[PDB]
Amino acid sequence: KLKAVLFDMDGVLFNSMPYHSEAWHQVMKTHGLDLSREEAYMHEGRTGASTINIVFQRELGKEATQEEIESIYHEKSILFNSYPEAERMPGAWELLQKVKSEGLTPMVVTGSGQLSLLERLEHNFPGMFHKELMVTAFDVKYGKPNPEPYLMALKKGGLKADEAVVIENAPLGVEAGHKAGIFTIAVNTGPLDGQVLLDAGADLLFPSMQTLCDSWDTIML
């Protein structure tokens, strides 16, 4: 019997990945470094530091310094913020209402550490989440694909792994939920092949958030 539902924020609650992928691609290009929009989708869920390091290690044969990480990340963040603000993923508010009406605790698990997440989550999904029942960059040392953030979600909610379900759209996020020993539902909201989500260890796979919403009662039976 389930108690909690653990949502990723990017690509699950907000339709932000076109923006995250473009900004990552463009900022790398500005620095003479090659990160494709597709590879940015492959790295969804990673910390900015980790993403920057991976490109530096492959292209430059070394790690980025902390000041280079912070510089490039701030530049990516400025660019991401220059775009008209990201909107709700279709089906998210509807699934959240279903989950809540069934007595389940909605939770957010995200590697973002921005304050206005609180405001933006609350404005888009009013009454759904509680800031204390949420995992952010203020908590994440390692981040996806390490199961750390989902394990910290379990801890914060006082949950056993078999009392939760993970809703994820990205393979590093699926892998994180899976390697935490939590039942993981993949929603293929991006441009990647469904196989990549199943290969990462998803127990179920749906084509979209709305189809997950439509199917929720049936899979919970």
Give me the residues that bind a second copy (CB under 8 A), please: 193-195, 198-199, 204-208, 210-211, 214-215, 217-219
**Please, what is the minimum distance in Å from the beta carbon of residue 8 to Mg ion?**
4
Tokens at 49, concatenated: 């530091």
Would you say 207 is a known binding-site residue?
Answer: yes
Nearer to Mg ion, 154 or 209 (CB): 209
Would you say 48 is a known binding-site residue?
Answer: no
Nearer to Mg ion, 157 or 171 (CB): 171
Helix axes 17-30, 66-82, angle to 10 degrees: 130
170 near Mg ion, rule: CB under 5 A: yes
Would you say 75 is a known binding-site residue?
Answer: no
Which of 130, 115, 128, 96 lies closest to 213, judged by CA?
A: 96
Nearer to a second copy, 30 or 195 (CB): 195
Would you say 119 is a known binding-site residue?
Answer: no
3-state SS of the chain? CCCEEEECCECCCECCHHHHHHHHHHHHHHCCCCCCHHHHHHCCCCCHHHHHHHHHHHHCCCCCCHHHHHHHHHHHHHHHHHCCCCCECCCHHHHHHHHHHCCCEEEEECCCCCCCHHHHHHHHCCCCCCHHHEECCCCCCCCCCCCHHHHHHHHHHCCCHHHEEEEECCHHHHHHHHCCCCEEEEECCCCCCHHHHHHCCCCEEECCHHHHHHHHHHHCC
With CB under 5 A as the contact rule, the residue among 4, 5, 7, 8 that binds Mg ion is: 8
170 is in the binding site of which of a second copy, Mg ion, none (Cβ under 5 to 8 A by kind)?
Mg ion
**Please, what is the minimum distance in Å from the beta carbon of residue 200 to a second copy?**
11
82 is in the binding site of which of a second copy, Mg ion, none (Cβ under 5 to 8 A by kind)?
none
Would you say 10 is a known binding-site residue?
Answer: yes
Q: Compute the C-alpha angle 134/135/140, nearest 5°.
A: 170
175 near Mg ion, rule: CB under 5 A: no
Which range in 20-28, 63-71, 148-156, 169-177 contacts Mg ion by CB under 5 A? 169-177
Would you say 169 is a known binding-site residue?
Answer: yes
Q: Which residues are annotated as a binding site for Mg(2+)?
A: 8, 10, 44, 168-169, 175, 188, 207
Q: Which residues are annotated as a binding site for Ca(2+)?
A: 8, 10, 44, 163, 169, 191
Q: Which residues are annotated as a binding site?
A: 8, 10, 44, 110-111, 144, 163, 168-169, 175, 188, 191, 207
